[PDB]
């Protein structure tokens, strides 16, 4: 009678037999694919063991946070720009984590093999962990940081701005709306393997560089869970590799997923990294090229080639429209700064030198513009100026891609300057590329997202901000700011005085 | 009534003083000029389980800070 027990893998050995056959034992969701009901999972886990390995990670994370990091005042000694950037990075990731919960719940329903279901299930739970983790970052920075506003209510104040819309595309709807397999590609095969995993590490790098030790503590912990999300995204391709329908649909859903994801992150991440920081880590162009071409588009998809998977056809396009995308976007984000839930800052000289050094030609375009805006007084509340006005004055209309929700200014952009406008059954639609346009043409009922110009049309700026709670606790000062300094913060009144009224830029083609 | 109930450390501690009983050789094994009143009370109503819990909670943080953020 020696001391003995049973471990998770010893029980997992029989987990595949848990599922039994019967008439209606099939997916409740539409899908062109057929997941082999004998598919196996990479990690032999059971609920008990899963909980233990995750709780152990929590111990450390929260230990560092409630103890040493708080004693060191890590919540304050962060660069102002980065404190703001984390309001977006963490809350936006939070929803990607939260929709990934529903997404894998859908994949779990799709899987027919008990092991493949269990794989997705472990993620359903991981994703819940990540939702709460990202939430904690904002929670911690609210309680301990230099500026709680935005961190304390991003869940409602994010609705005011246009950047949020595109976030729900790649990390919310793109995760749960459509064919379970297509969604799986958006979430795991592309989203996580191409962007989220490398990104999570990148953020900890930029965070550390700007005095933020809070994010590395949480995100590095989230990172330890991504090995399991990868296996599921890879197991999805395997569970369908044998179905004849896969040879007919996989690459199209994959290419669409690739485009969907990069369309948003290529410009948004780069922007948050280079403009939301003081200290730089590495040029986004270099970063992007390694992630999308070397790591993903080459090594990751190369290993799936034996399953019929090929490099996304829109890959070359993505690369060519990438170089300036994030620079083009910041111009719009800063011009529309009053619609955010975070404070933005204009590049200081040291940074302009950095940008030009890494992006030849940066100065003559963006640099000169930012300097003009500052002379105009875009940082000072008494100027009565807001970069959006400069766009109107110089006939540079800003459009919203009907599909990706990504804001674009074709007349000013240095990157893509394509614009396709269509009218269909009484409605106008604006597209920024041939891939998103095809998506809408083929699936118009999948993309009916009202953009901000449509919703805010005829509305006065301050009223939209006030209505959506874009104010600090003093009920007067705006959450968003055109600078990250401590004084001369714009107030609702400074905005009302501008008497800025939204207009749907498309009504011009009339 | 089936309301969710339990028992806490102080509820058990209430009767801890009665745990010791009397008998001839129930006395200290060590030399001492003093006589500790055998009715003396303690300030904190703890039991082994609860003591372990409040100490383990402190450990979580301590070792968490050490193995993680402080090492980083």
């Amino acid at each position: 009678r020696a001391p003995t027990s049973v471990n998770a893998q010893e029980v997992h050995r029989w987990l595949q037999s848990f599922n039994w056959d019967f008439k209606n034992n099939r997916t409740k969701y539409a899908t062109k694919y057929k997941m082999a009901n004998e598919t196996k999972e990479q990690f032999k886990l059971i609920a008990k063991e899963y909980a233990r390995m995750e709780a152990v990670k929590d111990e450390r994370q929260f230990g560092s946070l409630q103890d040493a990091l708080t004693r060191l005042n890590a919540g304050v000694r962060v660069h102002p720009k980065w404190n703001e950037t984390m309001k977006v990075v963490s809350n936006f990731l939070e929803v990607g984590e939260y929709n990934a919960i529903a997404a894998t719940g859908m994949l779990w329903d799709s899987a027919q093999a008990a092991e493949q279901k269990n794989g997705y299930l472990a993620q359903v739970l991981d994703e819940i962990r990540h939702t709460h983790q990202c939430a904690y970052v904002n929670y911690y920075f609210a309680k301990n940081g230099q500026d709680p506003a935005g961190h304390n209510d991003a869940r409602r104040t994010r609705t005011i701005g246009p950047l949020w819309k595109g976030m729900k595309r790649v990390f919310s709807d793109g995760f749960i709306s459509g064919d379970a397999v297509e969604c799986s590609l958006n979430l795991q095969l592309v989203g996580e393997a191409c962007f989220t995993n490398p990104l999570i590490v990148a953020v900890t790098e930029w965070a550390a560089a700007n005095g933020d030790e809070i994010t590395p503590t949480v995100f590095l912990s989230i990172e330890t869970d991504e090995l399991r999300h990868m296996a599921n995204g890879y197991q999805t391709v395997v569970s369908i590799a044998n179905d004849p329908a896969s040879a007919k649909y996989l690459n199209t859903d994959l290419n669409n997923a690739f485009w969907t994801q990069q369309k948003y992150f290529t410009p948004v991440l780069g922007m948050l990294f280079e403009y939301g920081s003081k200290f730089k880590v590495e040029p986004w162009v270099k970063t992007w090229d390694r992630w999308v071409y070397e790591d993903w588009g080459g090594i990751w998809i190369g290993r799936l080639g034996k399953y019929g998977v090929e490099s996304p056809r829109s890959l070359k396009d993505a690369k060519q429209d990438a170089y300036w995308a994030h620079h083009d976007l910041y111009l719009l984000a800063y011009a529309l700064w009053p619609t955010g839930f975070f404070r933005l800052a204009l590049p200081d000289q040291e940074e302009m030198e950095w940008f030009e050094a890494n992006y030849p030609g940066w100065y003559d375009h963006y640099g000169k513009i930012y300097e003009e805006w500052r002379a105009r007084g875009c940082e000072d509340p008494s100027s009565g100026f807001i970069p959006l006005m400069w766009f109107i004055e110089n006939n540079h209309p800003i459009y919203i891609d009907r599909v990706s929700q990504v804001p674009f200014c074709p007349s000013l952009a240095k990157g893509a300057s394509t614009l396709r406008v269509h009218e269909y059954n009484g409605e106008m639609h604006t597209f920024s590329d041939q891939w998103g346009e095809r998506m809408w043409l083929a699936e118009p009922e999948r993309y009916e997202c009202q953009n901000i110009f449509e919703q805010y049309e005829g509305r006065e700026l301050s009223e939209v901000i006030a209505e959506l709670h874009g104010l600090r606790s003093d009920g007067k000062t705006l959450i968003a700011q055109p600078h990250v300094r401590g004084d001369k913060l714009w107030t609702l009144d400074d905005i009302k005085r501008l008497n800025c009224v939204f207009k749907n830029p498309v009504k011009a083609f009339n | 009534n089936r309301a969710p109930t339990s028992v806490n450390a102080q509820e058990v501690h209430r009767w801890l003083q009665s745990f010791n009983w009397d008998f001839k050789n129930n006395r200290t094994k060590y030399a001492t000029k003093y006589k500790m009143a055998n009715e003396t009370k303690e300030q904190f109503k703890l039991i082994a389980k609860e003591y372990a819990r409040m100490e383990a909670v402190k450990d979580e943080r301590q070792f968490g800070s050490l193995q993680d953020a402080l090492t980083r």
Partner: protein, 386 residues
Amino acid sequence: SMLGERRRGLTDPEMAAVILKALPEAPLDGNNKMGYFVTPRWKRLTEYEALTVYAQPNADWIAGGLDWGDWTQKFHGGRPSWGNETTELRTVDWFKHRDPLRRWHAPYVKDKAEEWRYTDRFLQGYSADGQIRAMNPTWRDEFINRYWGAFLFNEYGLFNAHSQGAREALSDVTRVSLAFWGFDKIDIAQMIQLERGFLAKIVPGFDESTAVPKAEWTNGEVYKSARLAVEGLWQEVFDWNESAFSVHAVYDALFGQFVRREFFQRLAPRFGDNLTPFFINQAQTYFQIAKQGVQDLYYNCLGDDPEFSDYNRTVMRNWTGKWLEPTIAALRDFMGLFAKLPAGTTDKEEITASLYRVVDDWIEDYASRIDFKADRDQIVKAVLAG
């Protein structure tokens, strides 16, 4: 290097100095409470609420939503990412629910982890203490290996019944509870297998293979109607609330509670089996934990909704009647297992009484909440027909 090449803004003199110089004198807002705008269920906002409520990006057209506009991408056909169309139940606010145990991820895994580590210690103490000796051989190789074992498929099935709710739940709070309710079920199913695997190690000749208990589940008579009910709750229900509600406030509250508590928990001891009861203690803790959440969502929030109280109760009564029948059938078939027990193990009076306990508790904690008129004698007599 001893110092490493990477420089950190919190410790690097140069970088930190630049950082410190850019800092404001005091925080730009005194409101350091994330989730401050959330309506507290209790005196003060809890960490549980702050970290959960409103994580789901719902627009105002889904009761309680704070966002606006349609989803950015929908299903072919036009189905919304999340929508009112996925459940018959209606409410003034889907974010109203609150897990009475306030379980967000960290607390949840911490508890299951404690239970896992202790289970390991328990089994190691059980095996070394040779307690297996005093266990009845027939009860072991027959009722635990076959019948208790087959029950794991019941729990597994209830587990899978949650897959669609994890995807369709209309709010974070409800989604999280749902995920935890189902995850506890797969846990139990794996614990039943853990015991079988444990016995295989201390009892020379005990086959841990699931073949026997699976064959009992798929082709047996004892669990026939039980399996039929499980296949239905799982795959024939597309309404995430009917699924959760019917599974927890009907089938498992009756059939599950009877099998676990009134059969195995009640009889195992009589055969010198303290092992199985150890795992059932967990299953019952899990059950009582889930029940609180289930009650808050369906009774406190939905059944008592200021605007759809009447409507919702009507629907849940409909569901109760719809599933009460297959559940009674599952119990009826289960009655057959008693004839398999060594004579004298238990009599008809004990079984009736135990049935009445399960039924009265159900009427107690569920039926009465939605004014479902349940006749306890009729239900029991229908089952006893076995």
